[PDB]
Paper text:
[name], energy-dependent translational throttle A, is a ribosomal factor that gates ribosome entry into the translation elongation cycle. Here we present the cryo-electron microscopy (cryo-EM) structures of [name] from [name] (Mtb), referred to as [name], in complex with the Mtb 70S ribosome initiation complex (70SIC) at the pre-hydrolysis (ADPNP) and transition (ADP-VO4) states, and the crystal structure of [name] alone in the post-hydrolysis (ADP) state. We observe that [name] binds the E-site of the Mtb 70SIC, remodeling the P-site tRNA and the ribosomal intersubunit bridge B7a during the ribosomal ratcheting. [name] has a conserved ABC-F architecture with two tandem NBDs, an arm domain, PtIM, and a basic C-terminal tail.
Based on our result, [name] in the ADP state did not form a stable complex with the ribosome. Therefore, we co-crystalized [name] with ADP and determined its X-ray crystal structure at 2.9 Å resolution. In the crystal, the asymmetric unit of [name]-ADP consists of a domain-swapped dimer, similar to that in the crystal structure of nucleotide-free EcoEttA. In the crystal structure of the post-hydrolysis state of [name], one ADP molecule and a Mg2+ ion are clearly resolved in each of the four NBSs in the domain-swapped dimer. To measure the conformational difference, we align the two structures of [name] in the post-hydrolysis (ADP) state and the Trans_R0 state based on the NBD1. We observe a ~40o rotation of NBD2 away from NBD1 in the post-hydrolysis state, allowing the formation of two new salt bridges (E199/R499 and R216/E482) between NBD1 and NBD2. In order to evaluate the effects of such a large domain movement of [name] at the post-hydrolysis state, we superimposed the structure of the two NBDs of [name] in the ADP state to the 70SIC-[name] complex in the Trans_R0 state based on NBD1. Clear steric clashes are observed between the NBD2 and arm domain with uS7 and uL1, respectively. This may explain why the ADP-state [name] cannot form a stable complex with the Mtb 70SIC and has to dissociate from the ribosome after ATP hydrolysis.
Numbering used by the authors:
A (entry chain B): 4 to 552
B (entry chain A): 3 to 551
The structure:
Amino acid sequence: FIYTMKKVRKAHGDKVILDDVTLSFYPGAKIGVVGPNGAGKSSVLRIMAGLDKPNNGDAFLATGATVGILQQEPPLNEDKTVRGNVEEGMGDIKIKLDRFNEVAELMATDYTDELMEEMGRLQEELDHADAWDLDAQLEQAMDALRCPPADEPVTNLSGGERRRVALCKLLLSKPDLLLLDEPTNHLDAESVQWLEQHLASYPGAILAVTHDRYFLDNVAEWILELDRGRAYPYEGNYSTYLEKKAERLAVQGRKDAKLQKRLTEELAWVRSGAKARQAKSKARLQRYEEMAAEAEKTRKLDFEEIQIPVGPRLGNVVVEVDHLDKGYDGRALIKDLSFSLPRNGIVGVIGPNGVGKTTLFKTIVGLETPDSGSVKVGETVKLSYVDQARAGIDPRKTVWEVVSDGLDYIQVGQTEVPSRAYVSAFGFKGPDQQKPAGVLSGGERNRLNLALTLKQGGNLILLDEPTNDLDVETLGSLENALLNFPGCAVVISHDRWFLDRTCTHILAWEGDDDNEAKWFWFEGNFGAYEENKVERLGVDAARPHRVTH
Amino acid sequence: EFIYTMKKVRKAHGDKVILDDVTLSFYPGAKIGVVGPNGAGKSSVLRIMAGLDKPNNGDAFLATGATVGILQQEPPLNEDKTVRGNVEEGMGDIKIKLDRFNEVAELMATDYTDELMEEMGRLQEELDHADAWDLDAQLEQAMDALRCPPADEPVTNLSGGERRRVALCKLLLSKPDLLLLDEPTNHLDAESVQWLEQHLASYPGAILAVTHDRYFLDNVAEWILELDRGRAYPYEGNYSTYLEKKAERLAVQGRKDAKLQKRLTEELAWVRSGAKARQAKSKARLQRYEEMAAEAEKTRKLDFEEIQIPVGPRLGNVVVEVDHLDKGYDGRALIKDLSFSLPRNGIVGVIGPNGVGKTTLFKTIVGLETPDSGSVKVGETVKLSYVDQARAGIDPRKTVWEVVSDGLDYIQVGQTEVPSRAYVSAFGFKGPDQQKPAGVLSGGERNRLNLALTLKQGGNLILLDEPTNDLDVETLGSLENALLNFPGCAVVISHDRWFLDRTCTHILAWEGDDDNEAKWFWFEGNFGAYEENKVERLGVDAARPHRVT
Ligand SMILES: Nc1ncnc2c1ncn2[C@@H]1O[C@H](COP(=O)(O)OP(=O)(O)O)[C@@H](O)[C@H]1O
Ligand SMILES: Nc1ncnc2c1ncn2[C@@H]1O[C@H](COP(=O)(O)OP(=O)(O)O)[C@@H](O)[C@H]1O
Ligand SMILES: Nc1ncnc2c1ncn2[C@@H]1O[C@H](COP(=O)(O)OP(=O)(O)O)[C@@H](O)[C@H]1O
Ligand SMILES: Nc1ncnc2c1ncn2[C@@H]1O[C@H](COP(=O)(O)OP(=O)(O)O)[C@@H](O)[C@H]1O
Ligand SMILES: [Mg+2]
Ligand SMILES: [Mg+2]
Ligand SMILES: [Mg+2]
Ligand SMILES: [Mg+2]
């Protein structure tokens, strides 16, 4: 009410000292302003004092409110004495009290009954205003602040004396908005004590820029921290401010520690040899039950990073493919392919465009059926899968509406995830979450479909080029999510780093001119598959070639 | 000597600034991978460097005589040529000369002409010495390895992916001096990406590749250019080095935040204690000089980013003895009949309004002034740490660090070695502030300089005159802790009541009356205890602050 700043910005050239400051001060509010030197504190006070106007935005004083400012070079009436300066702060009441005392000392030398009537009117007016308590408060203030002798000329006074006189005048003018720039300057400790006890009961609102911590703990109701033009309000006094700031630091530090462990795992992986990489992948293949038991302890996730919630427990039979033949019209895509998918296995599917990878996905899910052979999926298996071409029939639904179904929390198996954070983890941050599904780019639709795939509880995750439109950071996040996932996953991707980092197996197209539909099943990652391919077929035939059919 | 230079480059579309004062110089043959989230500005940088767009401000210059090629989201292809024809157009004149050589070769088969023989020989000289016959072979190798469409297909029927592959092949065979790739792994299978990476590793020209393909960034890039909201951050090294640097700077930031959190929690714990409990740390000092001295005189490492006071010589039982001190100037007395003993490990807070004799008391203790009556005795074990409050220095060009360090990077002060740069940094002179000349220092900067000069003298009795001046709350706590761990005595003049309560074992307070204007009181306890005792002794009105006569 008493003052409002809306998108206020203040700059002198390249230095931005106020940056979209938007604050609303309730009447009588006590704010202490803190921040390093050059943060912008005195500029805020000067704008609120009406000495400065912002370059952009609205800086508005409540109409009918009064303002007073204490600044480094305080303005004093140089043609008036100390007591005169301090008296000038108070308005009409001081002139009427001086007139009352004048008529009082006039009625002893002279008399007039109309002077008595004037005195009765003045007494009523001043009693209705508590004028004599104001003169008493003037004397108490001048005494407690160690003001100079009340009849001294203010031109000869030093900076400290002038500052004390200005502070006294300002305190007695009692503005509705009181602005103090380092008020404890040139005050002794007991004077600071008195000033603090006085301003604690002060009626108006106060903006005090000070490093005096007892002042900030005993006077401030809000702590306004300024830093390079941004303003961070903290509700409470100085101690509450300490508590809240320490908590914000602790939270940010926990997040940074998570990121630290993930960055260190990525560095350790890239620096490791092939022996340790095969050790790690086969070890993953040998520890499904331990990981599942551990992961089934969690029942909620604060989705700061991508995490894949554990699904149902898996049996030994996951996916069994036996002599699979599959094609369309006269062109065969797969001929006589057989493999068994082990528990905790990550399969990388690789091959050129149009050879049958998505067709294999659809045969596994059962939207397509084999022309020969068998694809058996265990009764214990639950699929997480979205069609790559998934399109929404309602174009008006926003990304968050599509993923969350309107709910603040998403159930994924036994795990609860906050929907806003979940959708944010896939690159939809802020207003991107409100973008309608009908106007999504190809990459936005890809990330939407990935989020839709992973919110399905399951132990077999099917991913079709999930690296699309992800940055390197989110790539590492998805890698970590897969490395901590207890179920199985089949992944189509051209990202070789991802394949080497996560896959225990490779299923690769190796079609020939004679047989376009041969595939090879390999235990190991992409680099091991390529080396084995060179060893198996020779370097010239392991090289990529254009496909003909 | 620089294939491309950007100087103060700026790009904006209305008010949205997408490139902001980018200043980069790319040397010929440089391999840069460009990373960053969507909308950071990567494609805009590529278009500027390709000459497709010009910046609003600044210099964006391709080296004269150099060639540039760009792979963009909608690559332009000339529909009037076939796949092979489009890809051949990239090589240009050399391909036309080789086609002429083959034309003459198949012309000499139906009829001969000796003019054809000399033309063939002349062609052979240029094609063998300044060209390579294998250029057509590598053209076919690229079309095969990138899995281009059939070499004889019209490019009108091609899909977006086939068009992309044809464009990439054409671009690779045009061999520009600056090669710009915007998401080059798009529409490539993993084996095609492997071939592209191995091909670009041996590529002669310079490459700017915007890609999230981390094996590319690790095996091709020599620099990692990270873009963020129009800002450009170059990191020297490949992807592994980039990860290393990111993790280490994150670790540094985390240690910084943990330091700040610990200071916040320790300060909160102190303020949340009762009035008695706040005194515990300072009161413990009075019974533990010998333990504290034994600890401080053991050699350990020290965090010199916090305030540190090197321990001085050991103190005897007699520190400072003042007996019936009378002191004044002209006919005005400042101190009358003051007697006190300073205990070892004692910290004395001197309080009183301006001009009552605090600095003169300091000067009597140090001996710059002598008593008018009484005695001030300083123990034979005492070494004073003190600088005059008005210290300025006659050489204005000497910098802050030059003044403090006397030119030494490491200073011996007793048994302690201090790094001068970190030491002076602890007092708020960070970075280029340390090189600021002494003649242009503000009042607060000069106060902090004088404090840093005071604490490096290695005495066991420290005299500080308003040392809180121009210190932020963090450095205030740092100075507090430094004093609480110091094996010796300190006498401190200050108006900061938080400081006094946290550090003082004694208070020396001015208590002048109308009858005796030079009366002082010595009290065992901190500021708050002194005030409570003052009310107990004098009454509420006489304990209140008053004007000095
Ligand atoms: N009238 C002005 N002209 C140029 N620069 C100014 C002006 N007023 C303030 N500044 C600059 O703005 C920054 C913030 O100043 P100020 O608000 O006084 O900082 P503090 O937080 O120390 O009060 C400072 O670096 C100062 O140099
Ligand atoms: N329903 C269908 N009917 C006929 N042919 C199809 C059908 N679906 C896909 N195909 C053909 O199968 C080939 C490969 O399909 P797909 O597996 O989707 O490609 P990719 O191998 O890139 O995943 C394509 O050339 C396409 O023409
Ligand atoms: N012609 C344009 N008009 C307005 N804004 C544009 C234009 N081109 C690019 N931008 C803006 O510039 C920002 C970054 O552009 P760009 O370099 O294309 O993204 P990226 O770095 O992901 O390739 C985007 O937020 C985009 O909105
Ligand atoms: N050398 C001197 N000659 C005359 N008067 C002095 C001298 N030094 C100090 N004074 C006076 O003694 C009083 C106390 O000075 P000082 O102890 O510096 O005050 P404070 O306690 O505020 O530091 C001041 O009013 C000052 O004018
Ligand atoms: Mg200021
Ligand atoms: Mg597909
Ligand atoms: Mg782009
Ligand atoms: Mg002084």
